Each structure stands twice: as structure tokens, then as C-alpha cells.
Design a protein around this nucleic acid. Structure first.
Ligand SMILES: [Cl-]
Ligand SMILES: [Cl-]
Ligand SMILES: [K+]
Ligand SMILES: [Mg+2]
Ligand SMILES: [Mg+2]
Ligand SMILES: [Mg+2]
Ligand SMILES: [Mg+2]
Ligand SMILES: [Mg+2]
Ligand SMILES: [Mg+2]
Ligand SMILES: [Mg+2]
Ligand SMILES: [Mg+2]
Ligand SMILES: [Mg+2]
Ligand SMILES: [Mg+2]
Ligand SMILES: [Mg+2]
Ligand SMILES: [Mg+2]
Ligand SMILES: [Mg+2]
Ligand SMILES: [Mg+2]
Ligand SMILES: [Mg+2]
Ligand SMILES: [Mg+2]
Ligand SMILES: [Mg+2]
Ligand SMILES: [Mg+2]
Ligand SMILES: [Mg+2]
Ligand SMILES: [Mg+2]
Ligand SMILES: [Mg+2]
Ligand SMILES: [Mg+2]
Ligand SMILES: [Mg+2]
Ligand SMILES: [Mg+2]
Ligand SMILES: [Mg+2]
Ligand code: NA
Ligand code: NA
Ligand code: NA
Ligand code: NA
Ligand code: NA
Ligand code: NA
Ligand code: NA
Ligand code: NA
Ligand code: NA
Ligand code: NA
Ligand code: NA
Ligand code: NA
Ligand code: NA
Ligand code: NA
Ligand code: NA
Ligand code: NA
Ligand code: NA
Ligand code: NA
Ligand SMILES: [Sr+2]
Ligand SMILES: [Sr+2]
Ligand SMILES: [Sr+2]
Ligand SMILES: [Sr+2]
Ligand SMILES: [Sr+2]
Ligand SMILES: [Sr+2]
Ligand SMILES: [Sr+2]
Ligand SMILES: [Sr+2]
Ligand SMILES: [Sr+2]
Ligand SMILES: [Sr+2]
Ligand SMILES: [Sr+2]
Ligand SMILES: [Sr+2]
Ligand SMILES: [Sr+2]
Ligand SMILES: [Sr+2]
Ligand SMILES: [Sr+2]
Ligand SMILES: [Sr+2]
Ligand SMILES: [Sr+2]
Ligand SMILES: [Sr+2]
Ligand SMILES: [Sr+2]
Ligand SMILES: [Sr+2]
Ligand SMILES: [Sr+2]
Ligand SMILES: [Sr+2]
Ligand SMILES: [Sr+2]
Ligand SMILES: [Sr+2]
Ligand SMILES: [Sr+2]
Ligand SMILES: [Sr+2]
Ligand SMILES: [Sr+2]
Ligand SMILES: [Sr+2]
Ligand SMILES: [Sr+2]
Ligand SMILES: [Sr+2]
Ligand SMILES: [Sr+2]
Ligand SMILES: [Sr+2]
Ligand SMILES: [Sr+2]
Ligand SMILES: [Sr+2]
Ligand SMILES: [Sr+2]
Ligand SMILES: [Sr+2]
Ligand SMILES: [Sr+2]
Lengths: 132, 337, 53
RNA sequence: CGAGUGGCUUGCUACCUCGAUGUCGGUUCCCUCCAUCCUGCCCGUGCAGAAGCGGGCAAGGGUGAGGUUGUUCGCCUAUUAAAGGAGGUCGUGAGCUGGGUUUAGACCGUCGUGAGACAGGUCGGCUGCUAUCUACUGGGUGUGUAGGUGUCUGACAAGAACGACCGUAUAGUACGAGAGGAACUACGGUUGGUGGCCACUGGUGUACCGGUUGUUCGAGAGAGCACGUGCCGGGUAGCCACGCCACACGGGGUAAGAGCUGAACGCAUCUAAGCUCGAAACCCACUUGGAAAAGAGACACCGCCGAGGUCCCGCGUACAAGACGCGGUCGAUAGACUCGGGGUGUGCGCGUCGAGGUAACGAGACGUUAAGCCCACGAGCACUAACAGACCAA
RNA sequence: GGUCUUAAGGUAGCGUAGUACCUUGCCGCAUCAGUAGCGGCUUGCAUGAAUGGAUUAACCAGAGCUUCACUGUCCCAACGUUGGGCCCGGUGAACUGUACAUUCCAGUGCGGAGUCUGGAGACACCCAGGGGGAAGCGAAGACCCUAUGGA
RNA sequence: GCGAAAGCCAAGGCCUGUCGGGAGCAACCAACGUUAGGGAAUUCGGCAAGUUAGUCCCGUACCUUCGGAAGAAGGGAUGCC
RNA sequence: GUGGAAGUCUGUUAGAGUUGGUGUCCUACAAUACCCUCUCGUGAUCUAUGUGUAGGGGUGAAAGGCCCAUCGAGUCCGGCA
């Protein structure tokens, strides 16, 4: 993928439960897999800011609940490093459901998003209210 | 079904024993291209700090933007090329032929060597030039030593001696280039060899950690879960199969870790100056204060503070040189805190 | 930049930025300041802080 | 239908072992095989492209995470370039586990007159040993080569030190009616592996500073104990990874394969002789070790009445013993002291205030006070201690 | 089959069970995915009434399953603490020992060799280590068979 | 303090749960403390460890042999002067 | 409201016991020990001393358990070489 523009310490693994920062009807997401990733023996697959992931809906509306969907990580508690050396971290871990073309399924995003993610996924950004 | 997994640690840096010379010894040199020139220099590690640089890379989306870069500060005072050794090509490889020494020696070179009192610089030169005429001359190297005394933070006064190859141009020309240097008094500087922005390979003897177990030394796992409470926590499962009935040298075991020679490739030289611009408030921890000729190497360098590190023009650079990077800031903030 | 907590200047190439839930931003110069802030302490009430001084 | 190879399955035999060679599965750690799953390079196609399908060379590297089940196998899920198979006493219990098998207790079904059985199910049920030799990982002392110092050589030896993917430009281009949709090459990044480092972020930090509960020292101050910190907060050095740095390009020779020249065989023929090319594979390049390489090495200088070395002393860039490195007055090597740089968070005491209370009294607040206390770091500084001195030596 | 053996021929219930071989039975629940678990069906290889059947509040260091919470069990390991370990004084055993023994790769051999054969490697001694091998040490195999053995 | 509980302290007893000396004191082991983010992914199985916790107030389901279930659950308070 | 029942609850009170760690130990401190966790603790309770039952016999809330480290028939000597 296109360079992210920041160094990321993945703060999530397969099985992590995260916030769904949109209005798709899904409230909580469970990380199932990480796009393009391949680990090593005994390593739990990890994901962080900017990664595209496959998820299953843990909490939300009946219709969304249990559906296996694609998403993009927009916020994470573990710090990331920017070119100027400064570390940046968020209040929670969150992702945004997205389709085959990487367009957000929802109409609105909830909470801030990291600029780095905004740059990589434009249509996702053109849905954000706050870009940090 | 027993998943695959690469082995633990590399088999290319063995045996993992204590280094023989604390002073690094390059086992390879740059190719001959430009004009004659000494292919290396040396200094003493002081510590680290960081700097803000203007992105140099023309292929980087950030070209022209601020960028914080970690740097290791190395004190690189002038050295003395005290002699010129010639090698002849023989059926058994290269062998030292003779040496051409000088008269002017640093006041304390006698803490290591039995300095020459009677020597014939021309007989030596003569034999060398005849070797070339005959066409049996192998590369040309300078016997070099440091001047620890010029570095206060280093207790040592006893100079560290190392041979450094001279390459470039035609042998006749670099041979004369070599004799030139030596005869003066051999005094040369970091400036005479490297320019900020070029890539150098740095060699040094890593920090010593004495005896360490397989987990730390080879990176093997610790015993897991229930297997961690039975009496074994940091021991590998087994030394090998029933057959072969012996322990292979390839299974990870305990032993000397650290104090090994390492040659780190492609270290970018961020800046070569003199004075105390890079020194840190309160002084580099466990070192002292810098105020003299120094070099800023991008990133890390093997060895603890005070150890002798050696520089050589990169023998396998991956990138073209982007000369004299613009430095907008050099942190002088205390390293204690 | 100034530390949004104690008031001292943040050494360049250092510190962390905490992004609040509502999108707000807090530039911290060190763990010490972050940690005191997490305890619910207010910079003005801590004498060693520039804000206080 | 015919001919074979293997020794992963099963069967057969009873050759070895019954004065015991501990079982299945798993785990951990190491080496290997190729009948190749991916990656490299090719040939064919019912090959337009993209992609499939089949075939060839090839074992360098990779082949991962999860749900049921003791399971192997397998079924299933999401990822992936791919998530290949097999050998090493079905590698691996003087390494682990003990779920299964496989004692003694007990139940069910079936069988048995019964005791009791079952190649069915089920609950519970113990894992000894101070390593002699050998093997290897690291560390020393001697002898040999045959006075000392410093610098090298390179026979050999180890490496995967690098493997793979995504994205962008090429390009909505070639191709194709359209749908769809490449490549050479140049770039940016990720991942797995590898070596190192601590300025940054993070952890620790029974140094340290502070808060505070119970109790004891009459109170105060200042302290002990409450497990080797009572508990809680912060955290320097150092060590660390979750942090940071670095890990080719290019040559040479080949395989499959594409060809040239070219007979045998006037022609033809990539082959028989000769030659041009051509793989992640082979060699070199690169890193690491390496004078005990018995052809036991090379160079320069010093010294044989003295070069060098040992003991001794102050110390760590070193360290389980041993070893290693630095300094020793021609000195800043260690400590004291003073600054600098750091940690904590505003000391004792006194004054004012303080809900109240006749008063006694009074939790606490403010000031003095960027205070007090403390530091495994740096600098200055010969104040103290590196003194005195013993010995070996061609 | 629409009686026959041998007297009767399984009623109420429960049911793939701690009983169901077939079997991961089929449907559903739950999970991204559930040979598990629960509900239902049920022709029950081979359930069933004091050989007690069913059911059941309370109880349980009894067996299985799910959820919330939490966490170094794990990703993936790090730093620290106390006692050992290491060096020095003193004290001071045992196990084990046919012999020889510096081995490695192959082969051979009663087919599972440090000792035989061919090569390779190998200067002696010592310290620390984790235990690959000596089919290591510890017990005249418990399993199986045999004895005109025992209980 | 509810207490013959913990913890601390008297009277009284002891330094004999009887080998010492030394190395910031390495690997490794026994006991144990602290661990960012993820939170059972580990494992036959949450084994081990942890979480919760004393007291008062509010409040408390299915089911039941009407005893119970029940401290269900869940919520709030807690010092000093 | 009183009353204070209970093979009733909590409880390292005394005292009794032992689920798990398959921890430590395994030439042991010990021929059955140590630590944490765990269970019982007004009763079919626990405990001291005395006393009775004896080997094909006892005793057994039954495990072929126990009858002096020995029990699907104790120990000693004899039969016996
Ligand atoms: Cl995955
Ligand atoms: Cl393990
Ligand atoms: K046998
Ligand atoms: Mg695994
Ligand atoms: Mg620091
Ligand atoms: Mg800081
Ligand atoms: Mg036989
Ligand atoms: Mg093949
Ligand atoms: Mg095609
Ligand atoms: Mg291989
Ligand atoms: Mg197998
Ligand atoms: Mg096996
Ligand atoms: Mg074994
Ligand atoms: Mg065993
Ligand atoms: Mg053992
Ligand atoms: Mg079981
Ligand atoms: Mg029985
Ligand atoms: Mg069982
Ligand atoms: Mg069922
Ligand atoms: Mg009846
Ligand atoms: Mg054995
Ligand atoms: Mg026998
Ligand atoms: Mg039997
Ligand atoms: Mg009989
Ligand atoms: Mg943690
Ligand atoms: Mg698993
Ligand atoms: Mg438990
Ligand atoms: Mg009695
Ligand atoms: Na053990
Ligand atoms: Na074995
Ligand atoms: Na065959
Ligand atoms: Na096994
Ligand atoms: Na391969
Ligand atoms: Na599975
Ligand atoms: Na075996
Ligand atoms: Na075992
Ligand atoms: Na096993
Ligand atoms: Na080639
Ligand atoms: Na019946
Ligand atoms: Na009970
Ligand atoms: Na831990
Ligand atoms: Na062994
Ligand atoms: Na004594
Ligand atoms: Na009443
Ligand atoms: Na127990
Ligand atoms: Na008898
Ligand atoms: Sr050298
Ligand atoms: Sr070399
Ligand atoms: Sr065990
Ligand atoms: Sr063998
Ligand atoms: Sr035997
Ligand atoms: Sr082949
Ligand atoms: Sr392929
Ligand atoms: Sr199966
Ligand atoms: Sr098998
Ligand atoms: Sr295996
Ligand atoms: Sr079992
Ligand atoms: Sr079975
Ligand atoms: Sr059975
Ligand atoms: Sr000899
Ligand atoms: Sr493209
Ligand atoms: Sr199109
Ligand atoms: Sr204490
Ligand atoms: Sr507490
Ligand atoms: Sr060819
Ligand atoms: Sr020699
Ligand atoms: Sr019926
Ligand atoms: Sr019943
Ligand atoms: Sr040992
Ligand atoms: Sr007393
Ligand atoms: Sr004594
Ligand atoms: Sr702490
Ligand atoms: Sr689990
Ligand atoms: Sr699981
Ligand atoms: Sr509560
Ligand atoms: Sr009771
Ligand atoms: Sr109780
Ligand atoms: Sr047990
Ligand atoms: Sr425990
Ligand atoms: Sr025992
Ligand atoms: Sr009572
Ligand atoms: Sr007995
Ligand atoms: Sr007799």
C-alpha cells in the first residue's frame, strides 16, 4: 500500500473488540483478519492505524450483528510516530466499515480520525468531521 | 502438523566468542575509482542525541520538510598515518613486503610500540618501487594510529593502531600519494576522507554482556504456560534428536554474548564539525563533554561509549550521495531525565 | 510548542499528543505530566509547574 | 493390460531385545529428503488480453492464525505469494505435558447361573537420579612452532543475511467489438528473518523523593515493624522492545529452455567437435571466525644488561574462576568537596488565617519556600588514595 | 405373520443417554468458524419401572457447556527482589565402575557399534553449562506366553 | 476489631528452626514484585495467577418441598476535624 | 415485637481434614515431609487415658479397608536343607 507517513506500533490483534466509528448500525467490531498480512509461528495476527481489516459485528442492530465485513482502522490507543518525532495516541480503538472499493458504508463518521488514515483512504476522509 | 518457522538467530556471526582485538579490523575495502586516498578513519563513541533535518531524498513525498533524525556523536580528532606498508602478490596470497616509516612521532606512541630509532625510508621505498616495476606489488596500506590524548572524555592515552588501505587512481600515483602523507607526519583528518552526506560502513566491538542464556543470546522462546512452572523456564526443549547421537553446533546454547566485532553497513554521515554544537547539557552520561572534531552518524553504532569505532567509505551503498544535509536543529537537552 | 499541561517548551522531536474523544488535542512534554493529569490533578495547583509559577 | 521405484500406510515373518531400549497426540529445538504448494527461469495450450489448465529446470528462502475433537487425519472460518508432503527409534518424557492409552475405586449397556468379562462408553487416579565417559556451546592453563612489541596474511570454516508482498508512475496504455486489462523499467512502503543501539516512545527501576493506613518509641520532630517496598503516586542511571538504526548493485559458470556455426548423411539438423545466451538455484561479491595451516606463516621496529614482562597499586569500555581493557605523579584512575546536569514536589520551625468552642483546643489553608531531601552522570579540583617497593628476563 | 421358542412379548415414562455401534445422526440455538454444549426429532446396535421409572426445590473441594468482569495463560518477552548458583576457609558423603576409551561419517555384524572395516578428523590439561549419545543409572518386565507353579 | 482473626507492642523467652568469608553478585533454578497495547488468541481444560472483598443504605429474578433461592443480581456510602 | 431452634450459614477460635497446584522435595528435614489454595468446625462432632474383640479369626457407614513402615489371610520360631 501507499506509504502511511508515520510509523505504527500495531495496538490490535485478531479477536480484539473495537468501536465502530460510524452510523452503519454496527456498534462493536471484532477483528478477524488483517489485509495483506502474514505473520510467523505462534504470533497472533496484529493490526493498527491505517490497516484494512476483516471484521464481524459483535454489537449493534440485528441486521448488522454477525455480518462479516471489511473495515479500516482509524484510531488506536497505542502510540504512532510522526516524521517530526512526536508520538500520537487516541482515547479508544476504532474502525470504519468500508466496501469493496474502500468507500464508507455509513453516511457519517464518529469521532476524530488520524490524518495519515485520511490520506490513504480519501473517500473515508471525505466523510470525517475531525482529522488529527 | 508442526508449522514451519525460521531458526533462532543467525549462523553467520559465529562462533559467538569474545573478540580478539578491541580495535575493529575491516576484512574488505572500497574499490579503486577516484583519485588516490586513505579508505578509512577512526574515532571514539560519545553518545547520542537527535537532529532536525530537511528531507533530502528527491523521491520522498516529504522532500524539503522537517525531519527528526537520531544521531550518534563520535569524536573524530586527527590521526597519524605513521607508515606505508607494501604487499606483494605471491602464490599464497598477499604478503607484507616492507614498510616506509617517518621521524615525527606523537609523544605517546611509545605506550604501544617500540618506536623506530634507526630506519632507512629510501631502501624501503626502493624495494617497493622495484616490486612495482617487476609487477608483483599488491595493494598499498598505511599503518595508522589514534591520538586518545586529544579526547579528554577517554581515560586512555595509549594510541590504538590499525592498518588502513589506500586506493584510487594508478598504483604509481597512489603510492606517491601514500609516501606524501606518511612523510609529513601522517597527520590527517576526517575531512580529508569523508564529506557530510556520504555513506560509511562503521565497525566496532559490541557492548559486552558476558554469559547469557539461549533466550537472550539466540532469541529462543521461553517455556510457555504450564511448561513454565515445572522447573524449566528459560531452557530449550532438547539438544537434538536421538540420531545423530551428538549435539550439533547449530542448536542454541548459552555462552559469551556481546563484545563481538560487527561491521554495520551504510551509515549516513549527517555532519562533520568541530567544537561543542552536539554536546549535551550535563554532559553525555558515563562519558563527558564534547568540544573538538566530531562526526554525527545517522542512527546507531556498535559498542559502548568510549569504544574505538572505525569508518570506511561504504562498499555496498544502496543510495546515491545527497551531500551536506541541511541541519536546522541539534538537541543539546540533558540526556539525564 | 508549549506543553498544554505544565507550560514549559516542548523539546523538538519529543513528547506525545493525546487525542481526546471529542477530537480535542493535548500536547504533553513527558509521562510525568500525562500521569499527573491522569490523576485528575490540575497544573495550576502543582507548584513545580510553569503554569503555577 | 504390461513394467517398475519408494519404504510415508497396512499386512506378513519371529531375526535382535522380556536380569524393562517408557506409550499416542501435542510441545520445544536442531539437521535432512523431493515425488515442488509459493517464490525464480522456462515449454505447450482448446495461448487475444487478464486469467486459467497441463508440462520442464529448480530444495535458496517461505509455507502462518484460528472453531469442534486427546486426537493423528479430517471437517470448518478469516487471512495469505502459498498457507506442500515426508525422514531423523512413527527425531525429541536422564526436555516438558499427561488430554488419550494402560493397574488398584465406581457406574451404564451388553454377555455370564456366578466369580467376572467387553479390543463398548463413562467419573477419579503417582512421572525417581548430585553427569563418569562421549558430544557440543562458551571460558582458561600449558607444550609445540622457537627475546620482545605492534601490524597483517588467509589455508580452511559458518551464513539466508537476506526472503516475500502491497502500492505509484508506466496505464485505463498494449490486447480486445466490448467487457475486461497486462509488461520492461524507475520509485515509495509493509511483512518475515537477521545484526546492533537507547537521542525519541514505552516497560522496569525493593537508588531516590512524596502521600498515607495500623502499631510502638509520651506528643511534636524523627523513626522501626506490617517479607524481605505495609500500601499508593512519580521516577534518574542502567538494562530493555512495544522503541530506533543497518542488512546491494554487479560479475563468472550452468539447468530447463531460446538460438548460432556445423558435420556425420552433398541437403537438413541448437550438438557430435566449437560458440552466443539463460534460474530465487552454483561460484564470487558481503559479514563472522581463523598461525596448531606440522610447508606450524609475513612485515617493521626494539632488545640480548637489559626491550619487554610479572607482582604491586587506583579502576572498568571487561568479567561466574581464569581471561580482557585503562590509569599509576611525565597522573584526573577512584573517592571527598564545589558547581553543572538530573529525580521528587514545596521541609523543620515560626507568623497569619481557620468551621467552631467562654476558654483549653483545633482538621486544614497561605507565607517564608523554583522549597527541603536525594543521585550508580558530567566538570572543576591533587585535598585523600594510585605509595613504598620486590622480582623475572634472550 | 395379519403365531413360534421358552411363561409373557415392554404398559406410564424417558430416549443418540455416564446406555446409540452406525455417529461429527438430522433440525435449530450459539460462534467468523463449535466431533463440544443446550433444545427438538428419535425406528432405543443393546431404555424402562424398588435389577426401581420419571421428576425434582435445596445442597456439593463431584462431570460437561455458555456469558459478564479481570488478568503476562498467550501475542513476546523485559526489568527488579530474596535464597541458591560462581570464587575463598572449614567440614565432607553417596550413586556408579569387565577392560580399553579424543571421536565423526558410512558400512559390516545376532538385522539398533566410542572398540570390527574404510575413510575423515584429532596437540595435552582444566573451568562453567544445558543434557544429544553410552539402546545412561535405578527394579532378575508389570504386558504376553510357558510351568503336569502358588494363592 | 465482631473477635481466642490480622497486624504492631508488653511480661517472659531467644539470636541454636546453629557453618562462615567474597563477587552490582553472569547463565540457570526456587520463591516473589512491576509490566505498554491487545485480553483466554494460551490450554484437553482460565491449569496458574488474578478479579471481587469489611460495614451501612437502596434494591433483588427464574424456581420452590413456601423453609428457601439470597450476600441473587445491580446501585450508592465509607477519612479527618 | 419477643423467643432462640438447627446432623443451619460465615469463620486458619480451639480442633479436625485435605480439592487443586499434577508447585517444593524426591541419596529428602521426612521410608508419606513443606508451602499456598481448599473442606469441616453444636454434632452420625473432635479428642486423652483406661478397657474389650486375634489370624480363616477380629474390626470394617464396604475401599479387599484396617489389625505396630507388612494384609485377596499379621508377626515370630518351628516343620525345613
Ligand atoms: Cl488472520
Ligand atoms: Cl514450552
Ligand atoms: K523386550
Ligand atoms: Mg502453536
Ligand atoms: Mg535518558
Ligand atoms: Mg525527557
Ligand atoms: Mg525370536
Ligand atoms: Mg524434480
Ligand atoms: Mg496468459
Ligand atoms: Mg534447505
Ligand atoms: Mg510421521
Ligand atoms: Mg517417536
Ligand atoms: Mg530422550
Ligand atoms: Mg521421565
Ligand atoms: Mg533428571
Ligand atoms: Mg477425560
Ligand atoms: Mg472391586
Ligand atoms: Mg481420564
Ligand atoms: Mg445433544
Ligand atoms: Mg416390577
Ligand atoms: Mg533409557
Ligand atoms: Mg524375571
Ligand atoms: Mg496379568
Ligand atoms: Mg490355584
Ligand atoms: Mg501487561
Ligand atoms: Mg491453539
Ligand atoms: Mg483455579
Ligand atoms: Mg481409646
Ligand atoms: Na522440577
Ligand atoms: Na528418548
Ligand atoms: Na518396491
Ligand atoms: Na510425542
Ligand atoms: Na526451495
Ligand atoms: Na483444528
Ligand atoms: Na524409541
Ligand atoms: Na516424564
Ligand atoms: Na510424549
Ligand atoms: Na549467471
Ligand atoms: Na430390563
Ligand atoms: Na459433600
Ligand atoms: Na510475570
Ligand atoms: Na547427555
Ligand atoms: Na554455631
Ligand atoms: Na415469632
Ligand atoms: Na490437596
Ligand atoms: Na492367617
Ligand atoms: Sr585493521
Ligand atoms: Sr577475512
Ligand atoms: Sr511437573
Ligand atoms: Sr547412534
Ligand atoms: Sr537389558
Ligand atoms: Sr531432483
Ligand atoms: Sr510458480
Ligand atoms: Sr477424525
Ligand atoms: Sr502416528
Ligand atoms: Sr517433529
Ligand atoms: Sr488421565
Ligand atoms: Sr473412545
Ligand atoms: Sr473401559
Ligand atoms: Sr612432540
Ligand atoms: Sr500497476
Ligand atoms: Sr472498464
Ligand atoms: Sr520491611
Ligand atoms: Sr487493598
Ligand atoms: Sr542447451
Ligand atoms: Sr605459529
Ligand atoms: Sr413404548
Ligand atoms: Sr432418582
Ligand atoms: Sr549441570
Ligand atoms: Sr520483652
Ligand atoms: Sr555449632
Ligand atoms: Sr515502581
Ligand atoms: Sr479459552
Ligand atoms: Sr481456544
Ligand atoms: Sr456492591
Ligand atoms: Sr454445621
Ligand atoms: Sr465453616
Ligand atoms: Sr493431582
Ligand atoms: Sr502457586
Ligand atoms: Sr513423595
Ligand atoms: Sr456459637
Ligand atoms: Sr501395617
Ligand atoms: Sr525353614
Amino acid at each position: 500500500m501507499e506509504a502511511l507517513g508515520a510509523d505504527v506500533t500495531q495496538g490490535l490483534e485478531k479477536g480484539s473488540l473495537i468501536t465502530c466509528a460510524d452510523n452503519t448500525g454496527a456498534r462493536e467490531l471484532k477483528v478477524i483478519s488483517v489485509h495483506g498480512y502474514s505473520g510467523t509461528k505462534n504470533r497472533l495476527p496484529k493490526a493498527g492505524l491505517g490497516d484494512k481489516i476483516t471484521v464481524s459485528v459483535t454489537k449493534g442492530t440485528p441486521e448488522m450483528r454477525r455480518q462479516v465485513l471489511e473495515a479500516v482502522v482509524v484510531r488506536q490507543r497505542k502510540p504512532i510516530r510522526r516524521p517530526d518525532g512526536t508520538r500520537v495516541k487516541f482515547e479508544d480503538n476504532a474502525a470504519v466499515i468500508v466496501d469493496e472499493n474502500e468507500d464508507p458504508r455509513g453516511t457519517e463518521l464518529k469521532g476524530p480520525i488520524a490524518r495519515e488514515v485520511a490520506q490513504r483512504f480519501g473517500s473515508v476522509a471525505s466523510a470525517a468531521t475531525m482529522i488529527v | 502438523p508442526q508449522p514451519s518457522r525460521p531458526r533462532k538467530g543467525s549462523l553467520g556471526f559465529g562462533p559467538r566468542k569474545r573478540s580478539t582485538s578491541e580495535t575493529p579490523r575491516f576484512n574488505s575495502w572500497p574499490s579503486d575509482d577516484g583519485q588516490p586516498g586513505v579508505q578509512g578513519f577512526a574515532g571514539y563513541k560519545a553518545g547520542m542525541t537527535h537532529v532536525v533535518l530537511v528531507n533530502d531524498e528527491p523521491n520522498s513525498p516529504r522532500e524539503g520538510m522537517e525531519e527528526t533524525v537520531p544521531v550518534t556523536v563520535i569524536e573524530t580528532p586527527p590521526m597519524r598515518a605513521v607508515a606505508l606498508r607494501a604487499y606483494e602478490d605471491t602464490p599464497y596470497g598477499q604478503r607484507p613486503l616492507t614498510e616506509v616509516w617517518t621521524d615525527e612521532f606523537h609523544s605517546e606512541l611509545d605506550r604501544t610500540l617500540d618506536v623506530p630509532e634507526d630506519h632507512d625510508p629510501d631502501a624501503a621505498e626502493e624495494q617497493i618501487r622495484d616490486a612495482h616495476e617487476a609487477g608483483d606489488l599488491g595493494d598499498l596500506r598505511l599503518i595508522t594510529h589514534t591520538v586518545p590524548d586529544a579526547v579528554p572524555s577517554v581515560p586512555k592515552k595509549k594510541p590504538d593502531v590499525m592498518e588502513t588501505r589506500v586506493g584510487g587512481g594508478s598504483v604509481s600515483d597512489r603510492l606517491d600519494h601514500a609516501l606524501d602523507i606518511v612523510e609529513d607526519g601522517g597527520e590527517h583528518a576526517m575531512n580529508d576522507i569523508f564529506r557530510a552526506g556520504e555513506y560509511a560502513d562503521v565497525a566496532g566491538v559490541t557492548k559486552g554482556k558476558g554469559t547469557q542464556g539461549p533466550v537472550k543470546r539466540w532469541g529462543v522462546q521461553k517455556r510457555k504456560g504450564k511448561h513454565a512452572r515445572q522447573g524449566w523456564r528459560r531452557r530449550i526443549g532438547n539438544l537434538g534428536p536421538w540420531n545423530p547421537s551428538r549435539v550439533r553446533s547449530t542448536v542454541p546454547q548459552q555462552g559469551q554474548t556481546g563484545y563481538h566485532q560487527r561491521t554495520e553497513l551504510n551509515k549516513r554521515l549527517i555532519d562533520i564539525g568541530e567544537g561543542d554544537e552536539p554536546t549535551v547539557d550535563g554532559g553525555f552520561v558515563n562519558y563527558g563533554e564534547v568540544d573538538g572534531p566530531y562526526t554525527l552518524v545517522k542512527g546507531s553504532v556498535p559498542g559502548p561509549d568510549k569504544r574505538l569505532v572505525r569508518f570506511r567509505p561504504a562498499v555496498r551503498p544502496n543510495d546515491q550521495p545527497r551531500l551536506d544535509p541541511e541541519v536546522r536543529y541539534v538537541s543539546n537537552e540533558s540526556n539525564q531525565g | 510548542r508549549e506543553c498544554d499541561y505544565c507550560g514549559t517548551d516542548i523539546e523538538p522531536g519529543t513528547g506525545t499528543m493525546f487525542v481526546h474523544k471529542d477530537g480535542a488535542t493535548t500536547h504533553f512534554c513527558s509521562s510525568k505530566c500525562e500521569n499527573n493529569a491522569d490523576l485528575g490533578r490540575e497544573a495550576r495547583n502543582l507548584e513545580w509547574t510553569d503554569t503555577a509559577r
